[PDB]
Symmetry: D2
Subunit: 381 residues, 4 copies
């Protein structure tokens, strides 16, 4: 019994070694450059910090309305101080060839504006959800992309989150059997004192209440989990008339949907209840519980059958996939580099907007709203 070759050949003195094994995503290059517009809560707590983990993305320039703040951040992330644009001279980015695309992290109402604006600046557009505050503005955004022959991608991080991906895969492998009932809930207690929440209370700025904000996850999720689109929709909303927070936007709203397969779904969103992100998919073989379902971190899914609960979550020492944020950034970057369509196109973001408007209409009229308008998810869910 003797030691193996490798071990026996290791010098007992300081010596160089080969490239170590990768048990986590390693940085490769930094060829794609982003222009981030809107230094808000998401842009600073989740997005910018997300670039560090990218393999193909960098922060080349940032666009802000607050010059003093924009100066402080530029330092932290080391972006060229001379590359700190504003809303007035945002259009001038078309002069910088090192600015491949822009990432719009502005209030919902301002999405369409800077999207078509950037498209005429010859840049790729990564717009946050919800796409826009109007089906029309969504289509105009698509038109600008086509006209400029550029890429339009919506910020659906769940489309690039490991656990969410595992959930879809397991369903496509038929581990749940025939799908028949989906249940979604997304909630967070609205704080009017938080600067980021203030515009969300303004209807012309947000476009809607909790649905447009977080209920969209359940809606979108119900869609890619089931792998199909709603053909009919019904909904109801209610808000405490005495709560100053919901004068213009809805607090909570409940929507029921039917699909071509015969599958049904019921879900809700809320501005008056604590943190909730839970999805449930019922097949005739098993039931999947995603909880947390769409968190920034610590997602956890479980396939349940009588006597069993098979849970999956990110490992404790290894990282077989990149976090949703970095994976999202690089996804646009490498969709361009390889001339490939993006998984989350403007047509997909436009689909949620229509459905949401159809849902509001259903809650407004109290009648079923037909949504069987032949939409097709290009490239699968």
């Amino acid at each position: 019994a003797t030691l193996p070759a490798g071990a026996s050949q290791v010098p007992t003195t300081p010596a160089g070694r080969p490239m170590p094994y990768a048990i986590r995503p390693m940085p490769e290059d930094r060829r794609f450059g982003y222009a981030i517009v809107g230094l808000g809560k998401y842009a600073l707590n989740q997005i910018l910090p997300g670039f560090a983990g990218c393999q193909h993305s960098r922060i080349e320039a940032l666009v802000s309305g607050n010059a003093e703040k924009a100066k402080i951040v530029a330092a932290e992330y080391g972006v060229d101080p001379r590359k700190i644009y504003d809303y007035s001279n945002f259009d001038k980015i078309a002069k910088d060839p090192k600015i491949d695309a822009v990432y719009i992290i502005l209030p919902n109402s301002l999405h369409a504006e800077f999207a078509i604006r950037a498209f005429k600046a010859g840049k790729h557009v990564m717009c946050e959800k919800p796409m826009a505050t109007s089906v029309a503005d969504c289509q105009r955004m698509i038109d600008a992309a086509k006209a400029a022959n550029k890429k339009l991608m919506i910020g659906y991080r769940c489309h690039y989150d490991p656990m969410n991906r595992a959930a879809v895969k397991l369903i496509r492998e038929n581990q749940l059997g025939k799908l028949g009932m989906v249940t979604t809930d997304n909630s967070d207690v609205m704080d009017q004192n938080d600067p980021a929440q203030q515009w969300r209370l303004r209807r012309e700025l947000a476009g809607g209440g909790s649905l447009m904000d977080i209920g969209i996850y359940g809606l979108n999720g119900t869609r890619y989990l089931l792998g199909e689109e709603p053909i009919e929709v019904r909904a109801y909303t209610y808000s405490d008339p005495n709560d100053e927070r919901f004068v213009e936007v809805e607090d909570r709203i409940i929507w029921q949907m039917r699909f071509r397969s015969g599958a049904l779904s019921h879900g809700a969103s809320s501005y008056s209840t604590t943190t909730t992100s839970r999805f449930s998919v019922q097949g005739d073989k098993a039931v999947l519980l995603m909880d947390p379902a769409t968190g920034y971190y610590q997602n956890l899914i479980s396939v349940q059958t009588p006597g069993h609960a098979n849970q999956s979550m990110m490992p404790q020492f290894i990282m077989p996939a990149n976090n949703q944020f970095s994976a999202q950034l690089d996804h646009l970057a490498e969709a361009v580099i390889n001339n490939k369509p993006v998984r989350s196109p403007g047509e997909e973001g436009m689909q949620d907007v229509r459905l949401i408007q159809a849902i509001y209409e259903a809650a407004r009229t109290g009648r079923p709203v037909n949504t069987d308008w032949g939409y097709v998810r290009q490239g699968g869910y």
Copy 2:
């Protein structure tokens, strides 16, 4: 250091000792005699086996339409063969003073008449849920109870299940804060080859589909967790038109409600997907997840807040409270012995039936139904 008195006084030879510490409910007496009506699935799998752990209840007689089966069951539970009754000679139980009550475990359409004949026979009545198949019949049962001066109790085992009572208690202790959103789901794959499910597919016998059968748990649970009644309901139901199972009763139905406190709820029942029994109660301080929520066994609850999940379930060595079945049985017994009302009276069962009829009515018309009819829960939830 020396040994304590107790240990040092134990004889080393065979000797009598004290009553031991009780770590689970001990039997006490079998003073309250039941007559079980309908030796079917729930009866033979859950109720009859549930008598063993009772502290005041016993099986005195059986009522069956299958003499061969009754004879076998009677022998299995030491019942006197002379105490076997036909559905035709049922009324003669009035002649046996050793029969204090009957437990009706027949198809839904037959609960009313046998409860009424039981009262005419001067016996107390325990009746399974759903109470009956018409509001009118529920009232006739209540009128007969009062006319005979005997008690009327509906089989809501979840009203005597330790984990459900624990969820109710943490809610009343304001551990979730102000309640805003409740979500329920109760499902099971319908198998037309199971004899018990055969009458469930007949509208005339079942009185309805998945809502009457298992959706009632979500409905009833939403009411006792919130501790209040709904003021209006909305709903929609769908069933694949080609599925032989749902020609007369509904498969899947979704109902949402609004309560006087402002709270909302969305729930669903299914005959088309596998085992699901899950309740979530969202407050503005924390979120409660009951899953399993209403199982015959293994219920599990969890209070969730960012970074935490405090779970509760039955201990592994001790049994602080009796199981739901034995408890329910003794509950009616203790109520007559002590001359007190029951927690699940006929009025409670009637309220669920009225709400279910409202829900079916709301699904049928696609319009909301006002249910603000002033039902008051006597004794609390």
Copy 3:
């Protein structure tokens, strides 16, 4: 679409129906009669209540040194008052052919003599663990069983518990790979004021401390999970010198073992810390976690690998296998009826006692003790 034959043939009036689907063990007969010896804590809290779910067992007689208590217990379980025995007139059970066996639930030092007198009385014997307080006495019990041509079974409920048998099965199916490390812990806070614990603090009656009482589960479990016997043990024990509870028996003791396969294990038992019952079995493919591992209820197992945790526990509506207590009771009954050996014979109980004596011997000398004495598990683990 029309209704299936079954549903359409159900009468709408009161009518007899078929035997229902069984979703839990149904009673069958009570052919095997037991005489319970020692109406203490385990007997009244677990064993007597366990007879209800038996399919072939019944309580025929009681043996107690507290006539007042026996009279009460007899009435609680419908036992014939004439079937109450003294520890002095115990031998006269030989005169009752309706008594097939006895279940010895007395302090450890008294198991041997009453098992022997039981055999002399021509009865089968179920004896609680630990089998006895000396290896020699275990052999005398075995010799008496053989001399009387009656069976000898030790109360190892975990050998008939669904979750433990499920853990054994996944192990034998190589789901963990090659077994290398097993960890066990069994603890409970000793309370000298509980009558049952009083003899446990007396060396002469208990035969030892925490190892004899509950550490035996870790020991016995390590053997059936690994499916092999230890070839040597090592150990150390410690007990606060000023604590009146541990003047004669040990509080905490740690023992580690090596098996012929190469596998190792380290476990411990405690009278000083709260409820703990946890087993982990490390293989090179996956890790098994049993926690609760040996509870009277709610056992839970999980197979863990990076990114996964597949849990198993008893279902919420169905009961595939009978509870451990009822199962253990019927097991001896089926063994004599069918003329077969039991899974927990006297030899099995004797092996644990020999191993425990080796462990105490290893702790006492601080030296390792060779236990490679060729015990062979008849019938498998």
Copy 4:
């Protein structure tokens, strides 16, 4: 009912906003500069990627023996190509004032060498665990720090991991009661083909097997969880003599310890079994289960009592504390900036080395090894 001031004052046109709320650690400055020596598996998968999240640390220079690789990394992390040292001219760092400290991520045997070497280069030292391969080399490292009046810190990330910190806090708050039994297990299947594992198989390079490598976590953990030091130690080790992997170092080893408080602990480490990081702390009120206990990610702790399991883990949307890696880096950085002692000093790393040697001695001799040498954890655990 009107909208609140904040919301109503938000311009519906592009405008600048204030600094957003922080729900996650924000980058502040980058004043402290690190010199990372040893571009291995940890340095590249966990450490370097860890700087991005720091608030006070940057990568100023890297030391490697592989020039080609060192060139590739420098690009990825953008370190000055002219600042790529090697083992020969490592000493020259003393000339760069922008190099505040060095982080040694070299094989165990080479820890002492470059530590004292860097101390004479007038730099602060952050050495990875285990400190060194000799108690003596540990003391020499301490001497160099004192002589150079610099800071010596060991890489105990668990000392700066949220969940591990929560575990200590809860124990100090007495939520477990009086501590009496700790159980630890740390395992990973050794792969001789992995370049990083090859030196670990060499005794003069690693200093020991699984204990020195990962068993140290259980040892260290047992120490800060209990908040005290071992006074006595016993151990045993075994390795398959036919396995080429363990010719020089131990595969698995089991060690038992006793503390001044009377608390006991049993734990093990393994090179032949799958991923395992589990700690268990038993008090007389509750039991704590850390599993994962010391993972790079996804740690999970739980306080258990009969009927309860209160779990804690990182939130799903917020990040109230920085990850162990970044927190570790900045900790040295800010320990210098504020002239404060470090929580993980060389004296603490030296303590584990002694205990480990004492443990090996115990396993070698098979006798108890006294470790009551008056060590004192400066600054608490």
